[PDB]
């Protein structure tokens, strides 16, 4: 039994109604359940028997069936509702899950508040220098962070981390950490972090000593 979930991903704004459809290869009862799963967490049961809501699920989630066509409706999409949703079939003792649908939350385009941090005095003593650049509360996810040290473009000595979508304002936050030895950090004066989104670039910097 194959459950062809549709679509594979979507991007709707807050308040938009969301329709996730799960077509069944065969007519196999109403034993269809819906789940919500955020990154790093176990799935959460949303609706069982294809219509009845599990206890504690907000009313904005609802299930439907038309023959072999099962539907998940999110009436008023909340920013918290960003997750990957699955449809599961428990018939014929042959539990079958859907491919999955990733729900992202659309938003007005927002620029990041960029901050730069010199390495702490304590970390310098160990011999390693971590210079961190923070991109806070921006949309969309995509951006370009570039490191410059005395106007020399760095490459291969940085790592980036980005949060999941904020559950309130739908924005992203990114951190770019630049790691250098103490001798390398002491051998330069100006450290600049450059962030590029579309037609706008911002460069925040500090001079060692100031």
């Amino acid at each position: 039994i194959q459950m062809t979930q549709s679509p594979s991903s979507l991007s709707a704004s807050v308040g938009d109604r969301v329709t996730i459809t799960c077509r069944a290869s065969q007519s196999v009862s109403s034993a269809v359940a819906w789940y919500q799963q955020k990154p790093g967490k176990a799935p959460k049961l949303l609706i069982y028997s294809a219509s009845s809501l599990y206890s504690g699920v907000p009313s904005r989630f609802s299930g439907s069936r038309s023959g072999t066509d099962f539907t998940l409706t999110i009436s008023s999409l909340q920013p918290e509702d960003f997750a990957t949703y699955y449809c599961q079939q428990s018939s014929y003792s042959l539990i079958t899950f859907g491919q999955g649908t990733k729900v992202e939350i659309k938003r007005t385009v927002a620029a990041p508040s960029v901050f730069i941090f010199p390495p702490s005095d304590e970390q310098l003593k160990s011999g390693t220098a971590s210079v961190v650049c923070l991109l806070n509360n921006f949309y969309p996810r995509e951006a370009k962070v570039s490191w410059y040290v005395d106007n020399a473009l760095q490459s291969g000595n940085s790592q980036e981390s980005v949060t999941e979508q904020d559950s309130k304002d739908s924005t992203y936050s990114l951190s770019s950490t630049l790691t250098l030895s103490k001798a390398d950090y002491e051998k330069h004066k100006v450290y600049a972090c450059e962030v590029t989104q579309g037609t706008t670039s911002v460069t925040k910097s500090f001079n060692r000593g100031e």
């Binding site: 390495p119 970390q123 971590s130 961190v132 923070l134 981390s161 949060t163 904020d166 951190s175 950490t177």
Partner: protein, 219 residues
């Protein structure tokens, strides 16, 4: 011919769990005493545990007592060793042997059980707030959790009171094999002088909890 075959070995983190199997052929497991003996890379032989033929009496050694559990399933003629709370000393080759003549007559080929690279606690450095590197009212401060193993770590702010604006980033595996991450929070630029900010990082694997108070930098 009497033959003993062993499997189930592998690599696990300190703690973890693992069950080895002594598949027996050529004799009946239920009519013999069966012993598990280990030998650490480069070290000598160490008796681990024994099992009685029919009474199923289990005997252990203090090195593994309370952490390992021996068993046997007569139906499959297979003996078992459930190793839990695994430590560094448990890294060894594990044999299973048959008792006889007041000694161990037949031996298996052995399976390797290795522990994962030692647990390491986190290093917390302040992401110091400033004034120039600061928007008019919006101020940013944070903590850098660096060089910890294994996952996870839990970062809270002001003992869980500060939640608004806190963004803890996913960990990144550095080339050193150790994990690193940062947690940041945006605060009023005015509060920088009055409200105290502490990052409460906890690493249950290492049973360590660091509380660093982020404070203005020094010129």
């Amino acid at each position: 011919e009497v033959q003993l075959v062993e499997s189930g070995g592998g690599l696990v983190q300190p703690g973890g769990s693992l069950r080895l199997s002594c598949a027996a052929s050529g004799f009946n497991l239920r009519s013999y005493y069966m012993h598990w003996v280990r030998q650490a890379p480069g070290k000598g032989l160490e008796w681990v545990a024994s099992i009685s033929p029919y009474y199923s009496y289990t005997y252990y050694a203090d090195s593994v007592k309370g952490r390992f559990t021996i068993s046997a399933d007569t139906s499959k003629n297979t003996a078992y060793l459930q190793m839990n709370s695994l430590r560094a000393e448990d890294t060894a080759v594990y044999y299973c042997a048959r008792h006889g003549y007041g000694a161990m007559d037949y031996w298996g080929q052995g399976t390797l059980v290795t522990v994962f690279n030692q647990i390491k606690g986190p290093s917390v450095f302040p992401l110091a707030p400033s004034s120039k590197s600061t928007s008019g009212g919006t101020a940013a401060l944070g903590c850098l959790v660096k060089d910890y193993w294994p996952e996870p770590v839990t970062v809270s702010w002001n003992s869980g009171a500060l939640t608004s604006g806190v963004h803890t980033f996913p960990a990144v595996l550095q080339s050193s094999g150790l994990y690193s991450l940062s947690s940041v929070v945006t605060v009023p630029s005015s509060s920088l002088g009055t409200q105290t900010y502490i990052c409460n990082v906890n690493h249950k694997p290492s049973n360590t909890k660091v509380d660093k108070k982020v404070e203005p930098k020094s010129c």
